Ligand binder design. Structure first.
Ligand SMILES: [Mg+2]
Ligand SMILES: [Mg+2]
Ligand SMILES: [Mg+2]
Ligand SMILES: [Mg+2]
Ligand SMILES: [Mg+2]
Ligand SMILES: [Mg+2]
Ligand SMILES: [Mg+2]
Ligand SMILES: [Mg+2]
Ligand SMILES: [Mg+2]
Ligand SMILES: [Mg+2]
Ligand SMILES: [Mg+2]
Ligand SMILES: [Mg+2]
Ligand SMILES: [Mg+2]
Ligand SMILES: [Mg+2]
Length: 154
RNA sequence: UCUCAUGGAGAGUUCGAUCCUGGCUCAGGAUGAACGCUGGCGGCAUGCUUAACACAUGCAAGUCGGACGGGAAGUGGUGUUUC
């Protein structure tokens, strides 16, 4: 999914040397997502390199039986700050551009998200990833703490 | 994987490009609203925010004759009953 296409420029004695930057995110819509960035002369080739880069950067988002987040979480990258919190089933995914495309492409069905701080599409994508990467799932906190599930549920 | 949550969206704009700080601007709701165009019906509401500025006319607080003396309408007369 192409999130953003921009025309960045290097400048040479001749003139303006134009390239396209592509910010693209890949997912299966099944709980696997990644971001990648690429640069080329034509839209098409940039897009492609973006794809290939993302595919080698990719991670998994912890999901709950209703397709949402285990818990509330913040995230920080650059000036991008990101806030995600789980939602009741049937609220869909409400968020802004980077955060929402990444979330949606992961397959998260119901989530609240807001990016505070900056708006750069890219850093918000990365940030989202750092958010959902640090998501601990209950089985694992029960494994860490060394305490049975039913005890923490309470 | 029980319980809670029924909730927080962004976008353009400084640069040859970038990241940031930072303002302006927009998308939403609400009116005791006004103006423009257009206008079939019904239901329930609303209607001088300004000059506590002036007011023509008409009406918005009376009733009791079982407190009381009278007179005025009739009636034949203080037997009747009204004002
Ligand atoms: Mg900071
Ligand atoms: Mg914001
Ligand atoms: Mg400057
Ligand atoms: Mg310019
Ligand atoms: Mg700011
Ligand atoms: Mg409006
Ligand atoms: Mg008319
Ligand atoms: Mg008044
Ligand atoms: Mg008068
Ligand atoms: Mg009257
Ligand atoms: Mg009488
Ligand atoms: Mg009387
Ligand atoms: Mg009496
Ligand atoms: Mg008598």
């Amino acid at each position: 999914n192409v999130v953003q296409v921009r025309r960045v420029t290097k400048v040479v004695k001749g003139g303006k040397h134009m390239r396209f930057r592509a910010i693209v995110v890949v997912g299966d819509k099944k709980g696997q997502v990644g971001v990648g960035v690429g640069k080329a002369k034509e839209v098409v080739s940039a897009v492609q390199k973006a794809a290939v880069d993302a595919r080698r950067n990719i991670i998994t988002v912890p999901m709950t039986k209703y397709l949402t987040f285990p818990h509330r979480n913040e995230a920080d990258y650059g000036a991008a700050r990101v806030m995600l919190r789980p939602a009741a089933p049937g609220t869909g995914v409400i968020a802004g551009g980077a955060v929402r495309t990444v979330l949606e492409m992961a397959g998260v069905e119901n989530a609240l998200g807001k990016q505070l701080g900056s708006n750069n599409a890219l850093n918000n994508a990365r940030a989202t990833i750092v958010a959902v990467q640090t998501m601990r799932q209950f089985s694992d906190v029960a494994r860490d703490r060394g305490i049975p599930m039913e005890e923490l549920w309470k």
